[PDB]
Design a protein around this ligand. Sequence first.
Ligand SMILES: [Mg+2]
Ligand SMILES: [Mg+2]
Ligand SMILES: [Mg+2]
Ligand SMILES: [Mg+2]
Ligand SMILES: [Mg+2]
Ligand SMILES: [Mg+2]
Ligand SMILES: [Mg+2]
Ligand SMILES: [Mg+2]
Ligand SMILES: [Mg+2]
Ligand SMILES: [Mg+2]
Ligand SMILES: [Mg+2]
Ligand SMILES: [Mg+2]
Ligand SMILES: [Mg+2]
Ligand SMILES: [Mg+2]
Ligand SMILES: [Zn+2]
Lengths: 136, 39, 64, 193, 77, 140, 103, 135
Amino acid sequence: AGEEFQHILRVLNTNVDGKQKIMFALTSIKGVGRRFSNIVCKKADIDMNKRAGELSAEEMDRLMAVVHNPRQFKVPDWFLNRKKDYKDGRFSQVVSNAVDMKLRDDLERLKKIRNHRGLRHYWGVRVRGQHTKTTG
Amino acid sequence: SRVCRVCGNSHGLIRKYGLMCCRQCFRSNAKDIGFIKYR
Amino acid sequence: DTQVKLAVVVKVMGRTGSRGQVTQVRVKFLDDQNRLIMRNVKGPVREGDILTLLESEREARRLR
Amino acid sequence: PGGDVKLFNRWTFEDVQVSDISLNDYLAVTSMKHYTFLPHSAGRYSAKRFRKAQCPIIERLTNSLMMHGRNNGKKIMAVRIIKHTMEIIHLLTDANPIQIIVDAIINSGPREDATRIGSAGVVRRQAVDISPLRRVNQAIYLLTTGARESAFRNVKTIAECLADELINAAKGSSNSYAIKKKDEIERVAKANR
Amino acid sequence: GKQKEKVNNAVLFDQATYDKLLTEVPKYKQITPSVLSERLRINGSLARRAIKDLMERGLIRMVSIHSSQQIFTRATN
Amino acid sequence: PGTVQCFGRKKTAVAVAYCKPGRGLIKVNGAPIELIRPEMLRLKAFEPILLAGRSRFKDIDMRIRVRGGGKTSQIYSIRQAIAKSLVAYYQKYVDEAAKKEVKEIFARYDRTLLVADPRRCEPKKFGGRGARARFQKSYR
Amino acid sequence: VQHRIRITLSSKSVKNLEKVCSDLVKGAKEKQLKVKGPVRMPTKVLNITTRKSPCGEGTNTWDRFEMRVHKRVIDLVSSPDVVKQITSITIEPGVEVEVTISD
Amino acid sequence: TVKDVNPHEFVKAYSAHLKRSGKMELPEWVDIVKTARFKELPPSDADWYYIRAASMARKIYLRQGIGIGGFQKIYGGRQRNGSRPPHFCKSSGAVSRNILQELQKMGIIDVDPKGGRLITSQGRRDLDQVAGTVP
RNA sequence: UUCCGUUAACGAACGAGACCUCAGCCUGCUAACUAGCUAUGCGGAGCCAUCCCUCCGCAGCUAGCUUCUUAGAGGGACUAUGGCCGUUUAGGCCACGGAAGUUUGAGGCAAUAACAGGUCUGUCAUGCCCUUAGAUGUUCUGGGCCGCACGCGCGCUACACUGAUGUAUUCAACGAGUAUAUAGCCUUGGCCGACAGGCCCGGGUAAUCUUGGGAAAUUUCAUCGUGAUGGGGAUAGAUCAUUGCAAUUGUUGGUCUUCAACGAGGAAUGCCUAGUAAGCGCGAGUCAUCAGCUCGCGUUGACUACGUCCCUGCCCUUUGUACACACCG
Ligand SMILES: [Mg+2]
Ligand SMILES: [Mg+2]
Ligand SMILES: [Mg+2]
Ligand SMILES: [Mg+2]
Ligand SMILES: [Mg+2]
Ligand SMILES: [Mg+2]
Ligand SMILES: [Mg+2]
Ligand SMILES: [Mg+2]
Ligand SMILES: [Mg+2]
Ligand SMILES: [Mg+2]
Ligand SMILES: [Mg+2]
Ligand SMILES: [Mg+2]
Ligand SMILES: [Mg+2]
Ligand SMILES: [Mg+2]
Ligand SMILES: [Zn+2]
């Protein structure tokens, strides 16, 4: 009995399932894996044996508080996916749509550079040194 | 920078135990060195 | 109708089939211990096994 | 019947009755030499023909669980599986689960088959009998394969799938994989009698 | 069926399994494991492995626990 | 005076049972035999004690040191250790006839509580990864 | 006046080693010395597996070559001169004699 | 004593001891570290440090002179490399060192000359006391 | 082509066998502080508490110590004994015993004759030819050998609940360790660090130190719940560190993030008969760094058969032949 039990959650433009446990429901956001979702579920102090959907919203606001300010809740430097940015220089946690946004800004940088990796990206060939006689 | 002591070749070199012979010179001289084919 | 009859391999004769996967044995009927007939069996079999026959009439021939 | 050695120290080997005289010599539950605490005996069978007619039936069934590669060699898991299967079986039939297992093995063995033999000069498939040992072999094969095929991609545990398979085959009900396969083999055999 | 997604419907904590369903489910053989009934009564587990605990706290049916998450049942005796 | 020290062997595991005239004690590596811990193969270690009876062990303490092999091989080695140690104790201290008794109870149940398996792991030969298996062959 | 003298022998051949090893022990048995030996240490097998073919054609067949090395130890209590008197007899080829003084 | 109790219930009993027996410090990274390079998630149970302590003081109580580069092998395991074969990997030395340092800062164990770590007389005492109280 | 025997053959030579290596049995022999077990002493901890009892530590002129470990000398199996079939020969099947009764298992070695098999790119092995200074010689710098619409071969990871994850728990064997510069090859121990990795005090040329090699699968208790899911981990971004003179078409190892195909696979096809297949990990070779390979090693441990000549071939005989480069005639 979850009388206000939600099955859709729309957190951060990701359409989170209300039918799953929290630490695997919040992984639906593009930029949060199982490890970061675990850290969020810990620092916001949420019972992890709780289905996302049985939640209270005031908890949810804290979830977004920790995800948008990962540096602020003492989440360490090495944990974040934007270590030592090149456009600015900050240690950030890029989230759902900015992951794609930043990614295409990087490949655009390498394209304008005439970088080797930029041209490998543009040509559609593999970029990390793998062999390609018989793979692809 | 590592050659056969017997022929100065660069391929198939046996450096185990300090032999530093190529796999063919070692076969030609195995019995003289003392390596016996038991099994 | 048919009734399943019960027989005993009394001697084992040989190995028939293209690939030798079938044995030929002589069986003996337990209710009528006078009717001894040739049958083909699939699977390992020694002297003394009890064979269940769905029908009794069919009788094999030498080196079948 | 003074035989106080019991499977897992729970299931009495006294009072197990094999009805088929045909396979009575090829199921190892009736004599005292074949009673065991556990179905994991590091036996040196397969060394001679017909040795595995002496291997305890519970061990044969357990041996047939460790199948499909990712389960090869995993005998302790199969012994635990059989343990839970047996607890469930007696938690359904309230009867000695050895008897249920033995009845299922007997009931799930085909008695006819059809194979291509050469008659008088031309090859074509005739019907043949099944030896008792290959009857037991095929019976275990069918039950285990049925249980393993039920358990795949299912929330049902392999122990419970096996228990349902064995109780259904012991009933003889034509709902377990073992019975349907037995009857289909025997129908293909009858068709070419 | 979806018996871990079904763990938090209104029904699942109103009366559903609290003797409204599992009065009978063990009793078809008087004794049927809750881990056996995961499919015969199509309802699966962990909306159901946390209620076999609740019947324990409620003093209704005894159990055994083992390796593969095997769990068992007996209605009343 | 009773003391014997008898071993039991399997694939590579070996167990050795040292015997004293004590009360009921059986300990493998210092822990009670009740706690040899693959528990599915626990009735296997208890096979001799229930084969003879706890009563036949009312006046010996067994310290069984086991080593080598793996979990199952160590269990079978311990099995052989209890069995042959009891046989040797009844040989040297109790009686020649009541050791024949226990020998017959032990060797009617299983001949490898007293005789070890000569089976070893067959070496590997080149051309495949295994004793008998070979690399998969391709023609075209 | 009595030390702890350890004499260590190594060889590729069992018999040539054991002849000398017995000879030393008996030569030190006539002097009523304390000979604590011979101690046998695990045979060391130096193994090299090599492809028979020089050119990499045909069935890949290997030959495994092995040198067995045996390690004996004899213990004595004496002065180094008496032992040097003893370890001066005719030594078979291939045997190493490497006498030292243990602590 | 400790060898007369099953080592699972004993570790449960001891890890409940250190909890309600006073306290120890706990780092400010206990909720975030994985305990092994090959692990996927941190330990599932929030009370894992104490478990890792109670399981670990039984290692020194049954052995003598175990360093940290041996505990890393003790608690290491199988690492799966995706598409490459899996191998054996060692756990993290920071938790291994920190729990021993804490056992020192309670007097259950102590560092050993000749290297390693050894159980103390008082540390032996409480382990057999708690062992006496396990079913 | 092993033997009995037959017999225009008699007497011999190789190959098979014998032989050698490893594994299997030995409370029998020789021993062993670079292996240990036992007892006794002291040390700790429990406790009917004072002793006794249990579990560890430590030291020796404890052993009428060598069972366990190591490695030497030997012993042991010969089908020896019994039954049945057989010239009642050579042999065969069955059985008690026994560690072992397929030659006990597994290897090494291995005939005549041949191939236009492969190797001139292992060899200062070699004939002939070509070149030999503006070099096809040598050495340096940079690039390629790795490039990618595609076809093929050996494989690695998987498609999940007989499971993944996270605790607890914990059992091997075979091997390896160049003065390795001034701590250096294998690296214990202590400290810093989330990891990666780093600093310091050290051992070992080794049954002595790494390393009783504290392996994994497995076992255990939880979490997942039939969902391309928490199965799977490809592709990719950022960032840290290591090796090396230099890491770019990422050497490799870490952290967070990205979450592809894949729903057990058509025709075809490979390997396999017992500690075997399969599963699991470990060592060595290569090596400054890199193992999805190869060569070994242990661990867990089956299904089926104990046949046949149907398919693919092989040996011997008889037979036909217009084949002899020999039916790809
Ligand atoms: Mg399932
Ligand atoms: Mg794997
Ligand atoms: Mg041979
Ligand atoms: Mg050449
Ligand atoms: Mg160049
Ligand atoms: Mg190949
Ligand atoms: Mg995964
Ligand atoms: Mg696990
Ligand atoms: Mg390279
Ligand atoms: Mg390597
Ligand atoms: Mg290669
Ligand atoms: Mg003609
Ligand atoms: Mg012609
Ligand atoms: Mg033609
Ligand atoms: Zn050379």
